[PDB]
């Protein structure tokens, strides 16, 4: 039976230069290269805070439709979205910018919701640190440390909630359609109800238990790596008659993604020209190889030798 790799991202392993850092970095690179994702033990967020954030997601999605639509009409990022009688969701954009979070909260709760603002801000900052460390490890695994600071400058962070109503039956109930994330990295907590399901390169399906966090790679990181890392296709399939809420943390570049020249060679021709993340996100709501950034070049496994 297939299971995603299980990687220990506890804070005790996340000190640079230590042997535990190096062994986790090796595992992270291998998992992101073969699966594009892995189960993760993450203790940057306490169980209490993780549960509180879950409640804030239910509190937010419980608001009236016209209130949630105050968050705007960009469902590719933070805007409210809904498939009738199936799922709904929105995000808190720029979750690491306290001024933005306060603004969002005042919009949703004009009378004030202080525990909401403090809870999601604390969660987003903690999950941004994990995201930061993971990217630092990936860059080290490619010898690309000299590009790391510039890549991380003004990273945009998103806290996103997806809720799926009770399907009313046992067995498999499709709940979110297949896609790749357009993030750099995405960190997912399933809040004790599994459903997130990944396709492997070989066309098998892996549905993790809800034991651990899930880290998965988005198209932005795939493209930065010149396709050396895999961004996995994934969907949601409920497998029990219970509602589900997921908490997700996305990182997006300041603006432009560009493949380092050092990640291009004779066997790895440049797959993607530079592109703007906001243009791409809006394009997908009107496979990155389908976007205008694709050069037409052959992937590595198609190199002619
Ligand atoms: O609800 C989930 O776990 C999946 C959500 C997801 O994949 C996404 O919003 O991109
Ligand atoms: Fe996704």
From Swiss-Prot:
Any GO MF annotation of the entry: 2-oxoglutarate-dependent dioxygenase activity
Binding site for Fe cation: 179, 181, 234
Reported tissue expression: Mostly expressed in leaves and stems.
Binding site for 2-oxoglutarate: 244
InterPro entries per record: DIOX_N, IPNS-like_FE2OG_OXY, IPNS-like_sf, Iron_ascorbate_oxido_reductase, Oxoglu/Fe-dep_dioxygenase_dom
Domain Fe2OG dioxygenase intervals: 154-253
Induction: Transiently induced after wounding.
Catalysed reactions listed for this entry: (-)-yatein + 2-oxoglutarate + O2 = (-)-deoxypodophyllotoxin + succinate + CO2 + H2O
Enzyme class: oxidoreductase
Keyword Zinc-finger: no
Known EC number: 1.14.20.8
Function statement: 2-oxoglutarate-dependent dioxygenase involved in the biosynthesis of etoposide, a chemotherapeutic compound of the topoisomerase inhibitor family. Catalyzes the conversion of yatein to deoxypodophyllotoxin. Can also use, to some extent, demethylyatein as substrate.
PANTHER family named among the record's database cross-references: 2-OXOGLUTARATE (2OG) AND FE(II)-DEPENDENT OXYGENASE SUPERFAMILY PROTEIN-RELATED (PTHR47990)
This protein's name: Deoxypodophyllotoxin synthase
Upper taxonomic lineage: Eukaryota, Viridiplantae, Streptophyta, Embryophyta, Tracheophyta
């Amino acid at each position: 039976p297939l299971r995603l790799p299980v990687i220990d991202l506890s804070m005790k392993n996340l000190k640079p230069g230590t042997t535990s850092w190096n062994s986790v970095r090796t595992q992270v690179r291998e998992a992101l290269e073969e699966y594009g994702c892995f189960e993760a033990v993450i203790d940057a967020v306490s169980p209490e805070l993780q549960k509180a954030v879950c409640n804030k997601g239910h509190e937010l999605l419980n608001l009236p439709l016209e209130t949630k639509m105050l968050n705007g009409n960009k469902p590719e990022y933070d805007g409210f979205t809904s498939i009738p009688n199936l799922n709904e969701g929105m995000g808190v954009g720029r979750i690491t910018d306290l001024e933005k979070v306060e603004r969002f909260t005042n919009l949703m709760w004009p009378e004030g919701n202080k525990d909401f603002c403090e809870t999601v801000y604390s969660y987003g900052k903690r999950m941004a640190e994990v995201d930061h460390i993971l990217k630092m490890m990936v860059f080290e695994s490619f010898g690309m440390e000299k590009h790391f600071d510039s890549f991380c400058e003004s990273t945009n962070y998103l806290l996103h909630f997806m809720r799926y109503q009770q399907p009313g039956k046992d067995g498999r109930s499709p709940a979110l359609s297949l896609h790749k994330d357009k993030s750099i990295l995405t960190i997912v907590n399933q809040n004790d109800v599994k459903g997130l399901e990944f396709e492997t390169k070989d066309g098998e399906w892996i549905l993790p238990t809800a034991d651990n966090h899930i880290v998965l790679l988005g198209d932005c990181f795939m493209a930065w790596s010149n396709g050396r890392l895999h961004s996995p296709l994934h969907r949601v399939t409920l497998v029990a008659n219970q509602a589900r809420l997921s908490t997700s943390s996305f990182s997006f570049p300041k603006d432009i993604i560009e493949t380092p020249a050092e990640l291009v060679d004779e066997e790895h021709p440049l797959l993607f020209n530079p592109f703007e993340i906001t243009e791409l996100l809006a394009y997908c709501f009107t496979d990155l190889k389908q976007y205008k950034a694709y050069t037409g070049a052959l992937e590595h496994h198609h190199h002619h030798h």
